[model samples]
Target: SHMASMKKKGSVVIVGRINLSGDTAYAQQTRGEEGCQETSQTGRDKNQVEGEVQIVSTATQTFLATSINGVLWTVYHGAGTRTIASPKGPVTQMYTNVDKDLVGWQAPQGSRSLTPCTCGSSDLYLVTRHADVIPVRRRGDSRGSLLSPRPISYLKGSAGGPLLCPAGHAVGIFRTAVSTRGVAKAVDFIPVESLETTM
Candidate 1:
């Protein structure tokens, strides 16, 4: 088992936030004494599932920088099925994974993130762009756990930031710290070990 917190745990609700025209960050908050709910999607076109363009519209959409092996990977979301110019070249997607989203792109060759190391909860991580993996919202001190992501506004430039594990492994790019709401609190990153499932 794992450590538990006494704080009241609740299930989060997700809704449409990505707006048409890809102009600004959008989120539908039911409003609560608690806070904004979190929200992703599905699709066809096989490639359309990547929605690279839609996410690129804003900075806050909440994507992550990670790599499966040595190569780099960038992730982002799109409203409906569409196309965009990826960092590498032309990219397109006709479908969404959830919340009508897609995450596909080759990270531009740049500064090599620090080499890898073992990481865990309480381990300090630096988030970027308003940037960070740690949530900026107020919540019960019993934040559950490091793995237990908090919700944020999912604001501009918020999407597709790095969630550097202490592991710092240049492999498996970190997953979205986003993937939450009201913006999105720190990430609920997928462990490097989990990469095989995608394969």
Candidate 2:
């Protein structure tokens, strides 16, 4: 049923929150352009903004929040909520290293290379299968890190979906690949820590 709906409807910009158990699902309207695009140009694609809210996981009730400049919004589930300045313009891409620390390394560290199996306990990788990138400038310190405006395709996923932060917020975009030869290499994602101050 999920596959059928996706095939028939293509991609949908979910408003409000959607609840799904197995294949059944439903949606509610959000504040529309008012809540999503109030500070910027009207009718622009919601995906073009960095801080647009996305429902990460219904079961976990997680939100993958972004900032107006495409920076992530830090969320502390325990604290309930926090607010930050709205972006001056729209967002263009997903994987850009905007103006953050760009430390050169002698070699690729961390999870740069794929292993025989998935890393972490979830046994899956998460990534964004589809997204939009918008071109814009930084509002604050130009020395900070900034991401490019582009769709991040290669992300990690698990049996349920993408791995999330302890706060139930999405840490990475969900991807649908497993092997190195498949779409795994194309996955992309952003770090949840970048938005810590905003939350």
Candidate 3:
């Protein structure tokens, strides 16, 4: 019945985020709203942001992700450091293309609400034989740490799956990592509302 429900919901397996020319998922990664600023610094010490830990990178980010509206979404991490004034990368690739396999969705009631979630208590989704339930961090203070949930079990191929709420809300897209020891890899998701703003 879970598989049946998933199909009824009209899940679309995405190939990649849209890009300029509206055909490819290629773009220069950027920082948040602020344009990237990188300069040579003296001494062995690091700057504040330099000191902070980075959980996800392009290699592990959602290169190929699924979408309700067939459009890929990512965090607004400024832009490429090549230039401060210009949008990152080639101006051509800024626009993303909804893959050939586009699909649609019906947002759930009260989905406009945004809430912080902890542990496996709240229902989230990953596509594996029809959107299976996955676990969340239930141990430790679980603050300031990356939101590392289990990766999808049965993707058609490659990474770029997303985690969703029980109500069929997108928590964030999945990023790959080497899960080891007690320290499992984390998922850096783009908030559903924030993602919607782009569209």
Candidate 4:
């Protein structure tokens, strides 16, 4: 898992903010809350937005990103070690996964990303754009079901990062932290195989 996180972090980038018209229902709920502030890892003044983007296709320069406030985004690659270009969009929502939680869009020309990996049963890591590498083991006997270490509200924007296997392959996409009766338990993610079709 450690090796996978290191290898996959570069392919993930942050979504600073997203703007949407008021007619969209999600826009109303995420308004003013979409990009909430938090202290930086260094205890300094660090103000940044949320949501994550994963580089899914380098050849086409496309990506699979979590919809921030329900808007599509196309990201550009940066030269810095920890920096990526400010995401471009409110682009048209192109392809949605069967579960309709993950969205696929084309990136700007000449962008770069990792060739997506297939799912695996090995231990995994949940890698996000903020350099947050979470250790999670697959729950349930099923191949790609729930993940242990209950998801938290603080991880609100980690919807679409890669769920990488120990071999550094992307087995799935992080879904959402689930809560039941006010208690959070397990995370819900969509396996990579299910992303190619719709119900």
Best candidate (score: TM-score): 4
**Candidate 4 lDDT for residue 73:** 31
Quote model 3's TM-score.
0.32
Model 3 scores a C-alpha lDDT of 0.29
- For candidate 3, write residues 1-199 as lDDT tens digits: 4765562111121111222222322322223311112111111112121100011122112223333343332222311111111111211122232421111122221112223332334445443223333444322221112344443333322234455555444554443333445343443344444345444
Candidate maximizing lDDT: 4
Model 1 Cα lDDT, one tens digit per residue, 96-172 = 24321234333223313333334443344434333334422212221213344444443334443333434443223
Name the 10 consecutive residues with the lowest summed lDDT in model 3: 47-56
What number of clashing residue pairs does each candidate have, in the order they appear? 46, 39, 13, 0
Worst 10-residue lDDT window, candidate 1: 37-46
Q: Once superposed on the true structure, which residue ranges of model 3 sit more than 4 Å away at CA?
A: 1-63, 70-121, 128-133, 137-158, 176-178, 181-185
Runs of candidate 1 exceeding 4 Å displacement: 1-88, 92-102, 110-126, 132-151, 154-157, 170-187
Tens digit of lDDT per residue, candidate 2, span 56-101?
Answer: 2221223333222333321233002212212232222223232321
Instruction: Please provide, for model 4 over 76-158, each residue's C-alpha lDDT reduced to its tens digit, 9 standing for 90 to 100.
Output: 23111122223342223345434345555444332333334555465766655443556667774222333544445545555
Ranking by TM-score: 4, 1, 3, 2
Comparison by TM-score, 2 against 3, better one: 3
Local error of candidate 2 at residue 18 (angstroms)? 5.2
